[PDB]
C-alpha cells in the first residue's frame, strides 16, 4: 500500500438511473463472484418510502479491464421484477450460474409488520447468465407461528462452501428464539446450491450475545470466513462488523458464535442509524483490518460526507465529499484487488438526494488507492 | 395524424452518460441523427459548468435498434472525450454516414471580453467515425480574422444538406463587414448575428468551408441555435434574444451551387403555442414542417420540453404543439422543478400510429454540482 487516494471518471455507470422523470431508486445491493457481478435496487415513483408501489431492478455483468487498467462493470442482462404494493427489500448473491435474489414484499409498514405474527410475502428468483429470469417461488424453510417479520439485505449475500447465504433480520418471539438458540435479531438464510435450484433452505439465527439489535446488514466472504456488517440500530456509536464462525456439515450450516470487531475509526452521526456498509480489503483473522467506507461524519473537525480508507482504530486516508448540506443516504462499497500489489480500486454505491425530481437516486463512483 | 394520448416510458439504459465523478457537471446537450445513426455530445466540468473551471467535451455515436416492446433504443457504439480546455467548450455535432463531425469553440476569455476583441477564439473541427476512430481535423478553414469579433457554434446540432455539411453559428461582426457579406446595407459597432458553417464533404475530409451570414431582416439578434432538415428545407431554432415572447423557428431558403451554398432568406414561422421564460435554449423536435411557410403553418407539428412562466402554467412542460396551440401537455412539476437547456427529437413509426419523442433535459444537480443531463422517452399515439 501507499498513501494515495484519488477519484476516477466512470464513463458508463453500471447503476441504471430510475428510468423516468419522477422515478426514485433506493437500496443498492451488490454481489460479485470472481469476475461476475450482480447489482440490484428498488425503483418507485416520486418517493421510495412505501407509499407508492415499487419494482426491483436486477443486473448481472462481468468485469473487464478498461482504459488505464481500471476495472469496468460490463452489463450483460437486466431484469425488472413485477410490481409490488409497497417497497421491495432484497439481497442479491452472485454465483457462476447467475444471480440469486431474495426479497420481501411488505403489504404494510415496518411497525405494523412487527406487531403481527407471520412474515410478509417473500420471493426468491434467479437471473441466469443467459438473461433468463426464473421465479423460484416462495422461499422454502419459513415457519409461520415462530416469526413476526423477516427482511433480507439490503446488503448482498455470499457463496460459502457450496452454500447460498443471505443476510436477514427479523422479529421472533423470545420463547421461539430460545428454542432456535417480540425480539429483533439477525438471521442467515442458508440454502444448498446443488444444481440450478436451491435446496435444504432454512433460517439460521445468529447468536446475539455480542451483538446489537438486528438491523439491515451485508455479508462478506474473506479468507473462507464470514463477516457481517450491520446498520447500528442501538446506542452503540461505531461501525459494527462481526466475525462469524460456523460449523459446517453435509447440507447443514449453523452459526456457532459472532465476534464483534473492535472498530472505532468510523462512527454514526447519532449522539437512528444509516446503512453505510464498508468495503473490506483485508480481514482481521482474529490491527490488520483495512476497509473502505462512504460515511457521514459529525465530528467537529469534519462535518459532512467522507470517503475513508481506515484501519480498525484509525483512518489513514480521507476524501471530503462536501459540506454538511451534501446528502448521502445508504452506501455500499467494495474493492477490487490487482494481482500486482499496491494498486486498489474501490467502488462506492451512493444514495443521492434527487429532490425535487424524486426522493432519491443511486450512482456509483470509483477510487484508486496506490 | 395524431390523437389525444401521450405517455412516458422507462429508459432502462440512458444513452446520455453521467458526469462521471462526484462533483462533475454536464451541460449543453447536442444531438444529431442521420437515418438510423445518431450522435450525442455535451460539456463536462468539475463543480460548475460556467467557464470558471476547465472542461472537456464528451462525444458519442451509435445506432437505433428496436428495443423491448418495439420502442426505439439508442445503442452506443463509441464514445470519445476531447482534450481539456481552459474554460467551456461550445460545440455542435452533425451525424453523417461516415460518423459524427463536431465543431467547437474553445474560448480563453468570457463572452463579454470576447465580443470586445476583434478575432474569434480558437476553434476545432473533428470527427468520430463509425469505426470508433476520432480524427482531429485541425483549425476550421474559412474563418477570417480581421472581420469577426466572436463566433460560437450550436449548441444545437447541424444537418447534412445534400452534399454540404452545415453547422449553426452565432457571432460578432462589424457593421461594415456584415453589410459586405449580406450584399446590402443592414437595416434596423459590433453586431451579433446568426451564421452557417458550410463545408463540402469531398470523401472523408470537408472542403471549401466558409462562414455564411443569414439575412437578419426578419430575425432577432444572433443567439444559440439549432438546425433542422425537413422536406429538403433547412429550419433554424433560436434562443430568444429579444422581448419577443414566442419560440423562434426560422425557415431558410438557400441558393446552392458547386462548392457554394448561400442563404437567400430567413422567414420566421408564426409560432404562438409555446413561449420562452424570463432566454433559455429549449429547442423543439419538429415532426412535420409547413409545406409553405408564407402560406400557412397549420401542418406544423412539434414536440418541446419547455419552461412556462405564465400564471396558468408555472413550471416545466412536455408539449405536442401546432403553431398556434398545443394539443397535448404533460406537467413535469411545480415551478420549483427546474429544467435548463433542452433539446428534443422525435422518431416516427409509419406502420404504427405511434411517434416517439426524446427530451434531453438539463437538471439541477446541487449541491453535488451545478448541472446534469438526462434523457426521457415519450410515446404519442
Ligand atoms: C409519479 O409521481 C409524480 C410526482 O412525483 C406524479 O406527477 C405522477 O402522476 C406519478 N405517476 C404515477 C403513475 O403515479
Ligand atoms: C404504519 O401504518 C399504521 C396503519 O394505520 C399507522 O397507524 C402507523 O402510523 C404507520 N407507521 C409509520 C411509521 O408510518
Ligand atoms: C462472542 O460470542 C460467542 C458466542 O456468542 C462467545 O463464545 C464469545 O465469548 C463472545 N466474545 C468474544 C468471542 O470475544
Ligand atoms: C478497542 O480499541 C480501542 C482503541 O484504542 C481500545 O482503547 C479498547 O481497549 C479496545 N477494546 C478491547 C476490548 O480491547
Ligand atoms: C472539483 O470541485 C470540488 C468542489 O466542488 C473540489 O474539492 C475539487 O478539488 C475539484 N477538482 C478539481 C480537479 O478541480
Ligand atoms: C469578463 O472578463 C473581463 C476581463 O477581465 C472582466 O473585466 C469581467 O468582469 C468579466 N465578466 C463579465 C464581463 O461579465
Ligand atoms: C451604408 O451604411 C454606411 C454607414 O451607415 C453608409 O456610410 C453608406 O453610405 C451606406 N450605403 C448605402 C448604399 O446605403
Ligand atoms: C422576410 O419575410 C418576408 C415574408 O415574410 C420575405 O419575403 C423576405 O424575403 C424576408 N426577408 C429576408 C431578408 O429573408
Ligand atoms: C412534408 O410535406 C408534406 C406536405 O406538405 C407533409 O405531409 C409532410 O408531413 C412533410 N414532412 C415533414 C417531415 O415535415
Ligand atoms: C399568428 O397566428 C395567430 C393565430 O394563431 C394570429 O393571431 C397572429 O396574429 C399571427 N401572427 C402574425 C405575425 O401573423
Ligand atoms: Ca408480521
Ligand atoms: Ca474576440
Residue numbers in the entry:
A (entry chain A): 157 to 337, 375 to 464, 479 to 493, 499 to 582
B (entry chain B): 156 to 343, 374 to 463, 480 to 582
Sentences from the paper on this structure:
A soluble construct of SosV-RBP was engineered to include a portion of the N-terminal stalk region (residues 125−157) and the receptor binding β-propeller domain (residues 158−582). Residues ranging from 158 to 582 correspond to the canonical six-bladed β-propeller of the paramyxoviral attachment glycoprotein, with each blade (β1 to β6) composed of four antiparallel β-strands. Electron density corresponding to N-acetylglucosamine moieties were observed at all predicted sequons (Asn201, Asn265, Asn340, Asn403, Asn416, and Asn455), suggestive that these sites may be occupied on the native virion. Overlay analysis reveals that SosV-RBP shares the greatest level of structural conservation with orthoavula-, orthorubula-, and respirovirus HN RBPs (1.7−2.1 Å RMSD upon superposition of equivalent Cα atoms), when compared with protein-binding morbilliviral H RBPs (3.1 Å RMSD upon overlay with measles virus RBP; MV-RBP) and henipaviral G RBPs (2.2−2.3 Å RMSD). Two molecules of SosV-RBP were observed in the asymmetric unit of the crystal and form a putative homodimer through the interaction of the first (β1) and sixth (β6) blades of the β-propeller. Additionally, the angle of association between SosV-RBP protomers (31°) is substantially less than that observed in NDV-RBP, PIV3-RBP, PIV5-RBP, and MuV-RBP (average of 57°) structures. Indeed, while the glycoprotein presents some features that are conserved with paramyxoviral RBPs with known HN functionality, including a conserved cation binding site and residues that would contribute to recognition of the glycerol moeity of sialic acid, the overall configuration of the putative active site is incompatible with known modes of sialic acid recognition. First, we observe that SosV-RBP hexapeptide residues Leu243SosV-RBP and His245SosV-RBP impede into the region where the O4 of sialic acid is positioned in other paramyxovirus RBP−sialic acid complex structures.
